Structures are given as C-alpha cells and as structure tokens.
Swiss-Prot record, chains A, B:
Native organism: Methanothermobacter thermautotrophicus (strain ATCC 29096 / DSM 1053 / JCM 10044 / NBRC 100330 / Delta H) (Methanobacterium thermoautotrophicum)
Keywords: Decarboxylase, Lyase, Pyrimidine biosynthesis
SUPFAM superfamilies for this protein: Ribulose-phoshate binding barrel
Gene (UniProt): pyrF
Binding site for substrate: 10, 32, 60-69, 117, 170-180, 192-193
Lineage, opening ranks: Archaea, Methanobacteriati, Methanobacteriota, Methanomada group, Methanobacteria
Protein name: Orotidine 5'-phosphate decarboxylase
Summary of the function given for this chain in its UniProt record: Catalyzes the decarboxylation of orotidine 5'-monophosphate (OMP) to uridine 5'-monophosphate (UMP).
Gene Ontology CC terms: cytosol
Enzyme class: lyase
Length: 215, 215
C-alpha cells in the first residue's frame, strides 16, 4: 500500500468522510471502510469512494457468522465493489472457508483477523490467536490482521504466517500503538482517529509517513 | 415472542423478503434481520419492516469489533429502528459493555451470542462459551443466544444464565436442530431457511408452531 498506510474511515456521514479522505488521498492508496460508515450511508459508498479516489477498498466487516451467511455477506460486499474483506477467525475453519470460496469465485481477497487490538481481546481471543493463525495458514490464507498494541504478539503472528504473507495492523495512534514499532512486523499500518479526528488530517497523515520513511 | 418463533429473514432482495415475511406474519411477532438483507437493500429496510408488519426487529449483526466501533454500530442500528442487536461475547467484556451502554442510552436491548450453532464453533468458541456466558451475567446481560444444534450446551448455558434471562436459539431446521428439544431450554427458536426457502413458507411456519404448541 502507498506509504504502508491504510486509512480507517470510520466517520459516519458522507460529507465528512469524503472531505477527510480527499484531504489525505495523496498519502495513501487504500481505504478501510467499515460498518460505522456503511450502515449510516449505504453500501453504495464503497463504489463512490473507489471511483472518486481511485483507491483500493478493504471492507472491514469483521465477518463472524455461520458459513452460509458469511457467503452471503461476502457476495454482497464484493458486489458493492470492495477489493477485500476482513473476516474473524474465531468462528472456525468452515466459516473462514466460506469467505475464501466467495473471494475465489469473485477474484477478491480475504484478510483473516487473528488477535484484536483492544483490551478485551485478552480475555478469549488472545489465547486462541496462535491457533487461529495456524488455521489460516492451513486454509491457504495469505492476508492477515494483527494488533499494533501488542508488538510481541504481532511478532509471534508474523512468525506463524511467514514473510510471504501480507499483514496489516490496527491500533496505531488512538489505541496506543506506534507506527514504527508496528512496521517491524506488519507490512502496513491501519490508522483511523489519529488522522480523521485531527484538526488537520493531511498534516497528521504526513507526520506519520515521515516516521515511516525514516524506517 | 408470538408462538416462540422468530423468523430469520436472510433473503437478499426486498421483494422476496417482503413477500415471505407477509406470508408468515400471522405466526410471529418478531423478525431477525441481518447483513444479507441489510447490505443488499439498505438499513431503511428495518423501519420499513417494522412499520409494514408491526413486528419487533432484532438486528443480527453479530457485532465483533473494538469498543469504540461497537458503539457506533449500535447507535446506527438503533437509529434505524431496530429493537435489539445481537453481539458476540468472544471479543471481551469491554466490547460488550460498549453495546450495553448504547442500548441503555437509547432504550433498547442487547442479546449476547455465547456459543454458535455451526460445526466450526467447536474449534474456539465452544471452549470459551461458558465463560462468555458468565461474563454476560456479570455485566448484567439479560438476553442471550445459544445453539439449537447442541441442546446439552444450550442446557449448560441456561444453567449459567438462570431462568429469568431470555434465551433465543438459531440452528433449527436447516442446521439440524429440533424445535421441541430446543424449546426445553430456550424461550424462543430462530428459524430461517426451513421457512423462507420452503415452497409454502406459511405452511412451514404453521407446521413448526403445531409441533411447538404441543409442548
């Protein structure tokens, strides 16, 4: 991704989302759009963004249903123009395989979320994360998501998935993660609030890139 | 819930969804709407259904994000008219509390999904499910979702949450679960494909209710 930086566009109204994304477009090539924006403005916002900014769109829907419903969610999401979708691994292998089958049919990609970045992830997800990552490898998953807030866990995840897999990581900025440290293990960092709630989003994005290039 | 039966309306186009829900409305008072329909037709479909059928709407979004995003998802979902939202417990207590705080602010309800009904749930979720249920009790959750496909697990979940909590259960019909056995522990059963893919959805719903009333 351009500059190894992915914008998590979680503003909830179209006008603000369009303004901020346009202000930082020169510093990224990939926008992560999730339910806060889609449930507020509609799935058509994905194609509008993709077209208007000529960026790749990752739908961060953290898919976590049974196989049959996961297939339907992935189909609707790719039909809407998304390039990739983020799926939870904790529901198990059949749920993840359902997403991979649709991505294969539609020429898109699946990112497997292993361990989450917030405090509560320590309760149940962390203990299963190494196994979820190994399950991903066994299924042929090549794209993964891991926590910026726990670089030692990000390192262990990178260890399991190997150097050829692509790893992106949220939790930078607002949640406490560091761009530089996270990029020791992840290929790209996801940043939301530190950029979109900033008084000057372009300056915030630029400042992060400056740290990155220095690496 | 009328007849202890909740329709899982997962068709993906408005016309078919409206037709089937109208055909079975005399047998239910609650419709569960999820992402297959919402991502295909828009969040406005919730208010349309609520008005048209005068039914309660449970948004089955299996929310599974960090606290901050979960709040935004719940706010957008209740703004759209949903009476309740289903939330995953696996992500931890802070993620669940974020949903409860928004439900409290907006006068709505949160249903906590403990163990899922599909085969893959055995990999990671099942082993944490009793603890997720206890966490729910500790947080003051009063509405839960458990698996029709494993009545012995449904019994154990009922044991943890007590008789006063409300428990609904998916996996009846297509996934192999039985209405009668599931209702030994759950207050209501969720049924999707067995009704909406039937040649006569009203007859399918009626048949289920007849086996229920005989309890």
């Amino acid at each position: 991704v351009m500059n190894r930086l992915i914008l998590a566009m979680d503003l909830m109204n179209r006008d603000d989302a369009l303004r901020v994304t346009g202000e930082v477009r020169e510093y990224i090539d990939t926008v992560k759009i999730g339910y806060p924006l889609v449930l507020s403005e509609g799935m058509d916002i994905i194609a509008e963004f993709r077209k208007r900014f000529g960026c790749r769109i990752i739908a961060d829907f953290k898919v976590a249903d049974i196989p049959e419903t996961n297939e339907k969610i992935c189909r609707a999401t790719f039909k809407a123009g998304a390039d990739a979708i983020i799926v939870h691994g904790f529901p198990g292998a059949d749920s993840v395989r359902a997403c991979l089958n649709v991505a294969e049919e539609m020429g898109r990609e699946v990112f497997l979320l292993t361990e989450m970045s917030h405090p509560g992830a320590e309760m149940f997800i962390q203990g299963a994360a190494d196994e979820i990552a190994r399950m991903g490898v066994d299924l042929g998953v090549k794209n993964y998501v891991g926590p910026s807030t726990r670089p030692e866990r990000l390192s262990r995840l990178r260890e399991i998935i190997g150097q050829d897999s692509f790893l992106i990581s949220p939790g930078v900025g607002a949640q406490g993660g560091d761009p530089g440290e996270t990029l020791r293990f992840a290929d790209a960092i996801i940043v939301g609030r530190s950029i979109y709630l900033a008084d000057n989003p372009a300056a915030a994005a630029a400042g992060i890139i400056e740290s990155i290039k220095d690496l």
